[PDB]
Amino acid sequence: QEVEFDIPPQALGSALQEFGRQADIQVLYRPEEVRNKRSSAIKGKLEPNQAITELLRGTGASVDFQGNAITISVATITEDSGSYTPGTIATATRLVLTPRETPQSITVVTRQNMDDFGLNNIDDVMRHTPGITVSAYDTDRNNYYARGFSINNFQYDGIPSTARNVGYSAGNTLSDMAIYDRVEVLKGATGLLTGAGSLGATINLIRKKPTHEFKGHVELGAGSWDNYRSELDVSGPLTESGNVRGRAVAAYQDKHSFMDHYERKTSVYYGILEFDLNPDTMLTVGADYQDNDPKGSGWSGSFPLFDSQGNRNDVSRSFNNGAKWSSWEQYTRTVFANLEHNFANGWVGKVQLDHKINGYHAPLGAIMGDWPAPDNSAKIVAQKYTGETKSNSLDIYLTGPFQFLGREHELVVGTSASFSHWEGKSYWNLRNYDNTTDDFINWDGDIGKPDWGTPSQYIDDKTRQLGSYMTARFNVTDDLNLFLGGRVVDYRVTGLNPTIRESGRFIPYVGAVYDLNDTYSVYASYTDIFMPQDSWYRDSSNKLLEPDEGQNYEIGIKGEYLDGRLNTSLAYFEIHEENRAEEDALYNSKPTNPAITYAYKGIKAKTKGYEAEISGELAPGWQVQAGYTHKIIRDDSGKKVSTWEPQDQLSLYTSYKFKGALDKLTVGGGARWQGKSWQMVYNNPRSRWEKFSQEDYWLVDLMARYQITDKLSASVNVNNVFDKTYYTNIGFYTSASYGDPRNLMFSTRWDF
Amino acid sequence: XRXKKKTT
Ligand SMILES: *C(=O)[C@@H]1CCNc2c(NC(=O)CCC(=O)O)cc3cc(O)c(O)cc3[n+]21
Ligand SMILES: [Fe+3]
C-alpha cells in the first residue's frame, strides 16, 4: 500500500522514530551509527520501500526488509591511513566497535606508526607502546611488563599461542612486522576470548589481506653494526573476473650489534589467497613462516654482577658472555583456512581453522656464576635444548542483531577447541669437557663445542583446550549501553607429569558505557582470567596449587574528536590476584616431606594504578601516540613485587607533515621516560642481600623523510640520540644487560 | 620456574 508522508530535515534518529508512526512499521537502529548522520526531507504519497530509500539518501545506509519491520545499518584496516589511531576493534568481544564504545584499556600500534618509525619486529613495537616496559633476559629473549605482570598471551588473528614456557622461547618474542597490518594490546584480564591465559595484557596480531586493486612495494634498509634489511610485498586480483585475490610477501634481514661476536639473520615468507564462492560467501587459505638464526647467543644476561669474591664488576657495553658457537634458534610457521558467510538477517558467521608450529634448536654456551677469578679466569655452563610444538585450533562464531523492547541489540555466540603437542629434548649430562677459559677481560667468545651426550630430560606434553562463549550488548538508552557476557572452559593436559584437569571453569564479562556528550563517555568493567599451574609448583603436602587467577576492576572516561580521527582516555584500574606461586622459606629452611624439597605457597597480590593516553590527529597533518601510566603492585604480606617495572612511566611519539611547496617532507621524533626501578639481589660470596637501582632516564629518537620521485622515498631514523648508557635487566640470575647505544637506520621504498 | 637445570 501507498502511504502519505511528511518528514522535514532533523537529526536522523528522530526521523526514524517518526517514520515508524507515519508508515505503521517498527524501526530498529543503532543510535551510535545514527547520532552523526542527519535526515533529508521527504514529502508526498509514496511506497514505504521507496520512501525509506529517499529519506536515507547521501548516507550509504543499508536497509533490510523482514516481516512488518525494517533494520538500518550504517557500515578497520590501518594500512595507508596516515593515522596513529585505529578505526574499529573486534579483539575484545568479536563485536566490531570504536575505541570509545569499548569498556576496556586497549592500545593499537598502526601500520603507519610502524612504517614511520621503522619498527620491524615485535620488540621494536613494544619499545614504542605507551604503557609497556621492555626488559631483557638475554640477547634473543625479552620481557614485556604490563600492570605488574609479564605478558604470556600472544594471539595471531584471534588464535592464542600455546607455546607459553619462556624457558623454551620459540618465536613469540621476535615476530617480524612485514606480514601484519597492526598490533593491538588489550590490557587487563582478557579471559573472554583468550580463554586460559595470564594477567597484565594480551598481544593480538592482525595479518595483511589481499587488495582488490594492484598494490606493491620494495623496501631496502641499512643501519648501525652492519645491519641490512630487504622486503617485498605484492597484492591484487588474480582472475579477470576478480573472484580470486592474493598477496605474497618475503623479507630477509642480516645484522650484528654493539655486542661482540654476535649476529642474527631472519628469513620470513607469507602467502594468502581469497576465493569468492557466491556473493555472500568467502574462503581464505594462507601460509606463513619465519626463522630466527643467531650466532654468539648470550644466556642469563650479558655478564655476572659479582666476581669471585663479591665486589662489583665493570665492563664495556660491547661485552657478551656467550660463546661463538652458542645459538638460540627459534622458528615459526602457520597454515590456516578461514570461511565467512553473510546470512539473510544481517547475521554473519565465521569458521577459522589453524595449524601452527613453534620450534626451537638451542645449543647454548655462556659464562655464568660468580666470575671472573683473581687470576682473570672463568667458567662456562653449556647446555642444549631442542623441541617442537604442533598446535591445531578450531574456532567458530556467529554475530548479529536482536530486538527486545523496540530497541536494537547485538549478540555473539561461539565455541572453540584446541589440540596441541609439545615434544622436547634437554642435554646437560655432558661427556666431560673443559669448562674454563684463560681470559675474562679479553673474552671474544672463543671456546670449544662439547659432545652433548645422551638426553638428560624428555618432555612429551599433550594439551586439550575447549571453550564456549556468549556476549551481549544491551541498548537500554541512547546514552547507555550494558555488556553482559561470559565463557566456560575445559583445560586438560596429559603427559609424563601428573594430569592437570579443570572442568566447568567460568569467566564473566560485565561492562557498561554511559554517554555525557557527543565527545566524552564514562565506562566501567569487570573481567577475569585464569591459568592452570605448572607441574612443579606444589605445596608442602606435594599437592598442586590451584590455577593462578585474577580480576580487573576498571573505571574511567574516554574522549573522541573529529569523528574518530582523535581519541583520549583516562582510566583507573585495580587487579586482584589469587594463587600466586611464591617461596615459603618456612618449609625451605627445614624440609619435612621426603617427596618434595623445594615447595611453594599460593598467595594473593594487588595492583592499583591509573592510566592516561591519546592517539590520532592533533592538527591537519600532525599525528600523535602518547601515554602516561602509574602502578604499584603488592603481596599479601605487604611488599612490592615487580620492582624492576617502574612505578611511573611516560611515552610520547609524534610526526608532522609539511604544507605548501614542501609537502614532500616529513619530520618526526619520540621521547620515552620512566621512573626509578630496582631489584633486590643476593651476594653469594659475601652472604648478604644487596640493593641495585636504576635512576630515572630519558630515551629520545628523531626522524626525517622525503617523498623523492613520486614513487621513490627515503627516510632516516635515529634512536637513542643522546647515547644514554643505561641498564635493561639486573636481578635475573645475578646478571646484567645494557640498553641500545646510539642508532641509525636508513631506508628506501619504491611502490610499484 | 621453567624446569631447566642451569647451575643447579
Ligand atoms: C620461573 O619463572 C623462573 C624463576 C622466577 N622468574 C623466572 C622468569 N620469569 C618470571 O618469573 C616472570 C616475571 C619476570 O620477568 O621475571 C624467567 C625465567 C627464564 C628462565 O629461562 C629460567 O631459567 C627461569 C626464569 N624464571
Ligand atoms: Fe632458563
Short mmCIF file of C-alpha atoms in Angstrom, two decimals, chain A residues 247-659:
data_model
loop_
_atom_site.label_atom_id
_atom_site.label_comp_id
_atom_site.label_asym_id
_atom_site.label_seq_id
_atom_site.Cartn_x
_atom_site.Cartn_y
_atom_site.Cartn_z
CA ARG A 247 49.06 -11.45 -1.51
CA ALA A 248 52.67 -12.62 -1.11
CA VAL A 249 55.47 -11.06 0.96
CA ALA A 250 59.13 -12.02 1.53
CA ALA A 251 61.62 -10.39 3.91
CA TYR A 252 65.26 -11.02 4.75
CA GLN A 253 67.43 -9.32 7.39
CA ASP A 254 71.05 -9.85 8.50
CA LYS A 255 72.83 -7.82 11.18
CA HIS A 256 75.32 -7.54 14.02
CA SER A 257 75.10 -5.48 17.24
CA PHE A 258 77.20 -3.34 19.61
CA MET A 259 77.91 -6.64 21.39
CA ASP A 260 80.88 -8.78 20.32
CA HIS A 261 80.88 -11.94 18.16
CA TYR A 262 77.10 -11.74 17.80
CA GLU A 263 74.92 -11.78 14.70
CA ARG A 264 71.33 -12.63 13.78
CA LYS A 265 69.68 -13.35 10.44
CA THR A 266 65.92 -13.63 9.94
CA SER A 267 64.03 -15.05 6.94
CA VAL A 268 60.25 -14.65 6.52
CA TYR A 269 57.68 -15.79 3.93
CA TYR A 270 53.90 -15.36 3.66
CA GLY A 271 51.20 -16.06 1.06
CA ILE A 272 47.41 -15.69 1.28
CA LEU A 273 44.57 -16.43 -1.16
CA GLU A 274 40.92 -15.29 -1.20
CA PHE A 275 38.06 -17.06 -3.01
CA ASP A 276 34.56 -15.72 -3.71
CA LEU A 277 32.18 -18.69 -3.85
CA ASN A 278 28.89 -16.80 -4.03
CA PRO A 279 28.17 -13.08 -3.40
CA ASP A 280 27.75 -13.78 0.36
CA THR A 281 30.45 -16.45 0.94
CA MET A 282 34.26 -16.17 1.00
CA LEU A 283 37.04 -18.73 1.52
CA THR A 284 40.52 -17.75 2.71
CA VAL A 285 43.59 -20.01 2.71
CA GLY A 286 47.07 -18.89 3.81
CA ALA A 287 50.55 -19.91 4.92
CA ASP A 288 53.47 -18.17 6.66
CA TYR A 289 56.97 -18.89 8.00
CA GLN A 290 59.80 -17.20 9.93
CA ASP A 291 63.27 -18.31 11.03
CA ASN A 292 65.49 -16.69 13.67
CA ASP A 293 69.09 -17.93 13.34
CA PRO A 294 71.59 -16.27 15.73
CA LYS A 295 75.30 -16.89 16.39
CA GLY A 296 77.08 -15.88 19.58
CA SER A 297 73.90 -16.01 21.65
CA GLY A 298 74.11 -14.98 25.31
CA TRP A 299 72.50 -16.72 28.28
CA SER A 300 71.34 -15.32 31.64
CA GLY A 301 72.23 -11.66 30.90
CA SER A 302 75.44 -10.31 29.34
CA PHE A 303 77.82 -10.51 32.32
CA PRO A 304 77.85 -11.51 36.02
CA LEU A 305 77.23 -8.87 38.69
CA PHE A 306 79.88 -10.01 41.19
CA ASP A 307 83.34 -11.51 40.69
CA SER A 308 84.96 -14.45 42.55
CA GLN A 309 84.74 -12.76 45.95
CA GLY A 310 81.87 -10.27 45.56
CA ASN A 311 82.83 -6.62 44.98
CA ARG A 312 81.27 -5.32 41.72
CA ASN A 313 82.03 -5.96 38.03
CA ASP A 314 82.83 -3.21 35.49
CA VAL A 315 82.61 -4.00 31.75
CA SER A 316 82.02 -2.19 28.43
CA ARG A 317 78.64 -2.27 26.68
CA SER A 318 80.25 -4.45 23.98
CA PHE A 319 80.88 -7.40 26.34
CA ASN A 320 78.95 -10.59 25.53
CA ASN A 321 79.06 -13.65 27.84
CA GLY A 322 78.14 -16.05 25.02
CA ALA A 323 80.42 -18.45 23.16
CA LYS A 324 80.97 -18.19 19.38
CA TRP A 325 79.03 -21.39 18.71
CA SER A 326 76.13 -20.55 21.05
CA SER A 327 72.82 -20.11 19.22
CA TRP A 328 69.18 -19.80 20.31
CA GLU A 329 67.34 -20.79 17.12
CA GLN A 330 63.61 -20.07 17.01
CA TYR A 331 61.38 -20.89 14.04
CA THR A 332 57.67 -20.34 13.36
CA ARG A 333 55.29 -21.46 10.60
CA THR A 334 51.49 -21.43 10.11
CA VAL A 335 48.90 -22.93 7.75
CA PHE A 336 45.33 -21.60 8.09
CA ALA A 337 41.92 -21.57 6.39
CA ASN A 338 39.08 -19.10 7.06
CA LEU A 339 35.45 -19.04 5.87
CA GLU A 340 32.80 -16.37 6.48
CA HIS A 341 29.15 -16.36 5.37
CA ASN A 342 26.68 -13.46 5.39
CA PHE A 343 23.17 -14.61 6.35
CA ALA A 344 19.87 -13.05 5.22
CA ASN A 345 19.02 -11.39 8.56
CA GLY A 346 22.14 -9.18 8.83
CA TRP A 347 23.82 -12.03 10.69
CA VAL A 348 27.34 -13.23 9.90
CA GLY A 349 29.09 -16.49 10.84
CA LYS A 350 32.80 -17.29 10.60
CA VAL A 351 34.82 -20.52 10.70
CA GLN A 352 38.61 -20.46 11.10
CA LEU A 353 40.95 -23.44 11.24
CA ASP A 354 44.56 -23.02 12.34
CA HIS A 355 47.69 -25.17 12.26
CA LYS A 356 50.75 -23.71 13.98
CA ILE A 357 54.29 -24.88 14.64
CA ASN A 358 56.60 -23.43 17.30
CA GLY A 359 60.07 -24.96 17.42
CA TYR A 360 63.48 -24.35 18.94
CA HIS A 361 67.04 -25.62 18.46
CA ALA A 362 69.25 -24.03 21.12
CA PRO A 363 72.84 -25.23 21.66
CA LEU A 364 73.90 -22.73 24.33
CA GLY A 365 77.20 -21.70 25.92
CA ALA A 366 77.97 -18.73 28.19
CA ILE A 367 79.93 -17.61 31.26
CA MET A 368 77.69 -17.85 34.32
CA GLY A 369 78.40 -17.90 38.05
CA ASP A 370 80.42 -15.60 40.29
CA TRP A 371 83.23 -14.70 37.84
CA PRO A 372 85.99 -13.68 37.00
CA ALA A 373 88.55 -15.22 39.38
CA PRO A 374 91.53 -13.37 40.94
CA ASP A 375 93.69 -14.84 38.13
CA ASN A 376 91.30 -13.46 35.46
CA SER A 377 89.82 -16.93 34.73
CA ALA A 378 86.16 -18.01 34.43
CA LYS A 379 83.83 -20.97 33.69
CA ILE A 380 81.17 -21.75 31.06
CA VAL A 381 77.85 -23.55 31.59
CA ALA A 382 76.94 -25.39 28.40
CA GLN A 383 73.53 -26.99 27.78
CA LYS A 384 71.34 -27.88 24.79
CA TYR A 385 67.58 -27.51 24.38
CA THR A 386 65.69 -28.72 21.30
CA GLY A 387 61.96 -29.14 20.80
CA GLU A 388 58.82 -28.52 18.75
CA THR A 389 55.15 -27.76 19.34
CA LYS A 390 52.36 -28.65 16.90
CA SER A 391 49.04 -26.95 17.69
CA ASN A 392 45.68 -27.43 15.93
CA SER A 393 42.84 -24.97 16.53
CA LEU A 394 39.15 -24.75 15.56
CA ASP A 395 37.03 -21.67 16.32
CA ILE A 396 33.53 -20.77 15.08
CA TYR A 397 31.27 -17.80 15.93
CA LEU A 398 28.00 -16.13 14.89
CA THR A 399 27.15 -12.45 15.45
CA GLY A 400 24.12 -10.28 14.63
CA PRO A 401 21.27 -8.07 15.93
CA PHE A 402 18.12 -8.76 18.01
CA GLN A 403 15.17 -6.77 19.40
CA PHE A 404 13.61 -6.65 22.89
CA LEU A 405 11.64 -3.50 23.85
CA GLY A 406 11.59 -1.75 20.47
CA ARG A 407 15.37 -1.49 20.71
CA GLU A 408 18.15 -2.95 18.55
CA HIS A 409 20.79 -5.04 20.35
CA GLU A 410 23.56 -7.33 19.09
CA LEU A 411 24.78 -10.75 20.27
CA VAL A 412 27.81 -13.02 19.85
CA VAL A 413 27.74 -16.79 20.40
CA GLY A 414 30.76 -19.04 19.80
CA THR A 415 32.73 -22.20 20.58
CA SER A 416 36.41 -23.20 20.26
CA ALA A 417 38.67 -26.24 20.53
CA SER A 418 42.44 -26.70 20.65
CA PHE A 419 44.74 -29.74 20.43
CA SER A 420 48.48 -29.16 20.91
CA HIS A 421 51.52 -31.37 21.48
CA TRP A 422 54.93 -30.27 22.81
CA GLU A 423 57.91 -32.61 22.49
CA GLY A 424 61.37 -31.64 23.73
CA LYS A 425 64.92 -32.79 24.47
CA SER A 426 67.34 -31.38 27.06
CA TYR A 427 71.06 -32.18 27.34
CA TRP A 428 73.13 -31.30 30.42
CA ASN A 429 74.89 -34.64 31.09
CA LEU A 430 77.99 -33.52 29.16
CA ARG A 431 80.69 -36.03 28.30
CA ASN A 432 83.27 -34.14 30.41
CA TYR A 433 84.95 -31.33 28.50
CA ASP A 434 86.90 -28.30 29.75
CA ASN A 435 84.66 -25.53 31.14
CA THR A 436 87.38 -22.96 31.80
CA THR A 437 88.68 -20.05 29.75
CA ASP A 438 92.01 -18.26 30.33
CA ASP A 439 90.85 -14.67 29.78
CA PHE A 440 87.72 -12.94 31.12
CA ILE A 441 88.68 -9.34 30.24
CA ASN A 442 89.55 -10.15 26.63
CA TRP A 443 86.85 -12.78 26.11
CA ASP A 444 85.91 -12.88 22.42
CA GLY A 445 83.66 -15.93 22.90
CA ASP A 446 86.40 -18.42 22.00
CA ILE A 447 85.82 -21.89 23.48
CA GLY A 448 85.35 -25.42 22.11
CA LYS A 449 81.98 -27.03 21.39
CA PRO A 450 81.26 -30.12 23.52
CA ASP A 451 79.84 -33.58 22.91
CA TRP A 452 76.29 -33.16 24.18
CA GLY A 453 75.94 -36.84 25.14
CA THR A 454 72.56 -38.51 25.64
CA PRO A 455 69.38 -36.58 26.57
CA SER A 456 69.00 -35.75 30.27
CA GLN A 457 65.27 -34.96 30.39
CA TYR A 458 62.49 -35.72 27.91
CA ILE A 459 59.31 -33.65 27.56
CA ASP A 460 56.14 -35.01 25.92
CA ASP A 461 53.06 -32.86 26.63
CA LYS A 462 49.56 -33.09 25.11
CA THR A 463 47.06 -30.29 25.81
CA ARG A 464 43.34 -30.10 25.01
CA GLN A 465 41.52 -26.78 25.39
CA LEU A 466 37.75 -26.35 24.98
CA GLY A 467 35.69 -23.16 25.01
CA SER A 468 32.12 -21.92 24.75
CA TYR A 469 31.18 -18.24 24.96
CA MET A 470 28.34 -15.72 24.70
CA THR A 471 28.35 -11.90 24.91
CA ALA A 472 25.50 -9.38 24.72
CA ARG A 473 25.40 -5.60 24.31
CA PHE A 474 22.12 -4.12 25.52
CA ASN A 475 20.84 -0.88 24.02
CA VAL A 476 18.84 0.28 27.06
CA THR A 477 19.12 4.01 26.27
CA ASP A 478 20.65 6.15 23.52
CA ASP A 479 23.25 7.31 26.06
CA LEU A 480 23.63 3.95 27.90
CA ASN A 481 24.92 0.51 26.85
CA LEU A 482 25.30 -2.60 29.01
CA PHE A 483 27.53 -5.60 28.31
CA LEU A 484 26.68 -8.98 29.81
CA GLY A 485 28.87 -11.89 28.73
CA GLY A 486 30.83 -14.97 29.81
CA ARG A 487 32.83 -18.05 28.81
CA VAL A 488 33.13 -21.64 30.07
CA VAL A 489 36.43 -23.55 29.71
CA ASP A 490 37.81 -27.09 29.98
CA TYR A 491 41.60 -27.23 30.44
CA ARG A 492 43.28 -30.63 30.31
CA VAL A 493 46.96 -31.57 29.93
CA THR A 494 48.35 -35.11 29.68
CA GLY A 495 51.99 -36.22 29.62
CA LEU A 496 54.86 -37.52 31.76
CA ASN A 497 53.95 -35.37 34.78
CA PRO A 498 50.59 -35.98 36.55
CA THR A 499 47.42 -34.94 34.68
CA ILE A 500 46.14 -31.39 35.22
CA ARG A 501 42.34 -31.14 34.90
CA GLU A 502 39.90 -28.24 35.21
CA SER A 503 36.28 -28.88 34.20
CA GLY A 504 33.49 -26.28 34.07
CA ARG A 505 35.59 -23.18 34.74
CA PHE A 506 33.72 -19.89 34.29
CA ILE A 507 34.89 -16.45 33.13
CA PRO A 508 32.45 -13.49 33.33
CA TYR A 509 32.35 -10.28 31.27
CA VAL A 510 30.43 -7.34 32.76
CA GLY A 511 30.58 -3.81 31.34
CA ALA A 512 28.70 -0.52 31.00
CA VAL A 513 29.18 2.67 28.96
CA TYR A 514 27.30 5.94 29.53
CA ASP A 515 27.41 8.98 27.24
CA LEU A 516 27.75 12.56 28.51
CA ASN A 517 28.13 14.42 25.19
CA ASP A 518 28.94 13.87 21.53
CA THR A 519 32.52 13.82 22.88
CA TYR A 520 33.06 12.24 26.32
CA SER A 521 31.82 8.91 27.70
CA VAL A 522 32.33 7.08 31.03
CA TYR A 523 32.71 3.32 31.46
CA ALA A 524 33.13 0.51 33.99
CA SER A 525 34.07 -3.14 33.51
CA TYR A 526 34.66 -6.35 35.43
CA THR A 527 36.86 -9.01 33.81
CA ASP A 528 38.72 -12.21 34.76
CA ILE A 529 41.29 -14.80 33.62
CA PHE A 530 42.94 -17.96 34.97
CA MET A 531 45.91 -20.19 34.07
CA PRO A 532 46.40 -23.73 35.47
CA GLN A 533 49.63 -24.09 37.45
CA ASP A 534 52.67 -25.90 36.04
CA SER A 535 53.60 -29.35 37.39
CA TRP A 536 56.45 -28.29 39.70
CA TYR A 537 54.51 -25.61 41.64
CA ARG A 538 53.46 -27.72 44.64
CA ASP A 539 52.73 -27.02 48.32
CA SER A 540 54.18 -28.67 51.45
CA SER A 541 51.82 -31.65 51.04
CA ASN A 542 53.03 -32.32 47.47
CA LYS A 543 49.64 -31.09 46.21
CA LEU A 544 49.34 -28.89 43.12
CA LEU A 545 48.44 -25.23 43.57
CA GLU A 546 45.03 -24.11 42.31
CA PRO A 547 45.15 -22.16 39.00
CA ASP A 548 46.55 -18.61 39.04
CA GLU A 549 43.52 -16.36 38.70
CA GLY A 550 42.89 -12.60 38.65
CA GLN A 551 40.22 -9.95 38.12
CA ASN A 552 40.34 -6.45 36.57
CA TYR A 553 38.26 -3.63 38.08
CA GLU A 554 38.31 -0.66 35.72
CA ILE A 555 36.55 2.72 35.70
CA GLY A 556 37.32 5.78 33.55
CA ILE A 557 36.40 8.34 30.89
CA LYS A 558 37.07 8.28 27.13
CA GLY A 559 37.10 11.04 24.50
CA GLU A 560 36.58 11.28 20.73
CA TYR A 561 37.05 14.21 18.33
CA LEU A 562 36.93 14.88 14.55
CA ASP A 563 34.57 11.90 14.17
CA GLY A 564 37.21 9.38 15.27
CA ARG A 565 40.41 10.95 13.97
CA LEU A 566 41.40 11.53 17.63
CA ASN A 567 40.81 9.65 20.91
CA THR A 568 41.63 10.46 24.54
CA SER A 569 41.26 8.17 27.58
CA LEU A 570 41.81 8.31 31.35
CA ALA A 571 41.19 5.17 33.40
CA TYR A 572 41.67 3.87 36.94
CA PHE A 573 42.34 0.15 37.41
CA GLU A 574 42.76 -2.43 40.19
CA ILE A 575 43.82 -6.08 39.77
CA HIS A 576 43.26 -8.73 42.46
CA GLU A 577 45.21 -11.98 42.05
CA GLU A 578 44.83 -15.28 43.90
CA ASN A 579 47.07 -18.37 43.93
CA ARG A 580 50.31 -16.53 43.16
CA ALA A 581 53.16 -19.03 43.41
CA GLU A 582 55.76 -17.85 45.93
CA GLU A 583 58.56 -19.26 48.12
CA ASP A 584 57.62 -20.38 51.67
CA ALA A 585 61.03 -20.19 53.38
CA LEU A 586 59.47 -21.78 56.48
CA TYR A 587 59.49 -25.16 54.71
CA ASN A 588 62.57 -24.44 52.59
CA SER A 589 64.75 -23.85 55.68
CA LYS A 590 63.98 -27.34 57.04
CA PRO A 591 62.02 -29.69 54.68
CA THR A 592 59.68 -32.32 56.16
CA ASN A 593 58.10 -34.22 53.26
CA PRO A 594 60.52 -36.65 51.50
CA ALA A 595 58.61 -36.38 48.17
CA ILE A 596 59.48 -32.67 47.71
CA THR A 597 62.45 -30.45 48.57
CA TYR A 598 61.50 -27.09 47.02
CA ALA A 599 57.87 -26.22 47.85
CA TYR A 600 55.63 -23.22 47.07
CA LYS A 601 52.92 -21.07 48.67
CA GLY A 602 49.79 -19.75 46.93
CA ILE A 603 49.36 -16.11 47.94
CA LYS A 604 47.34 -13.03 46.85
CA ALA A 605 48.55 -9.85 45.13
CA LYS A 606 47.07 -6.45 44.22
CA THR A 607 47.93 -3.84 41.58
CA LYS A 608 46.36 -0.39 41.99
CA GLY A 609 47.04 2.35 39.43
CA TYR A 610 45.78 4.67 36.68
CA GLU A 611 46.44 5.49 33.02
CA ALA A 612 46.10 8.36 30.52
CA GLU A 613 46.67 8.18 26.76
CA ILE A 614 45.96 9.91 23.44
CA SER A 615 46.26 8.96 19.73
CA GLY A 616 45.46 10.34 16.27
CA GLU A 617 45.14 13.77 14.66
CA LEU A 618 46.21 16.82 16.68
CA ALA A 619 46.15 19.13 13.64
CA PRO A 620 45.58 18.59 9.85
CA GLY A 621 48.88 16.75 9.21
CA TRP A 622 50.09 16.25 12.79
CA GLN A 623 49.86 12.74 14.28
CA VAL A 624 50.49 11.57 17.86
CA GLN A 625 50.78 8.46 20.03
CA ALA A 626 51.40 9.07 23.74
CA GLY A 627 50.57 7.80 27.24
CA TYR A 628 51.24 8.01 30.99
CA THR A 629 50.96 5.01 33.33
CA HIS A 630 51.26 4.77 37.13
CA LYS A 631 51.32 1.44 39.01
CA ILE A 632 52.14 -0.15 42.39
CA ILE A 633 51.77 -3.92 42.99
CA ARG A 634 51.91 -5.60 46.44
CA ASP A 635 51.99 -9.08 48.04
CA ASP A 636 49.59 -10.16 50.78
CA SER A 637 52.23 -9.60 53.44
CA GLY A 638 52.54 -6.06 52.08
CA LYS A 639 55.71 -5.92 49.99
CA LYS A 640 56.33 -4.65 46.46
CA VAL A 641 56.76 -7.10 43.58
CA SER A 642 57.98 -6.47 40.01
CA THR A 643 60.11 -3.63 41.43
CA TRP A 644 62.07 -3.72 38.17
CA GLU A 645 58.97 -2.40 36.40
CA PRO A 646 58.92 1.38 37.12
CA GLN A 647 56.05 2.91 39.12
CA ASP A 648 55.73 5.92 36.80
CA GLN A 649 56.24 5.95 33.02
CA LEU A 650 55.77 8.41 30.14
CA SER A 651 55.80 7.68 26.39
CA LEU A 652 55.32 10.20 23.55
CA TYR A 653 55.79 9.87 19.77
CA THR A 654 54.84 12.42 17.10
CA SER A 655 55.21 13.34 13.43
CA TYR A 656 54.42 16.41 11.33
CA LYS A 657 53.63 16.57 7.60
CA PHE A 658 54.59 19.87 5.95
CA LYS A 659 52.30 22.11 3.90
#
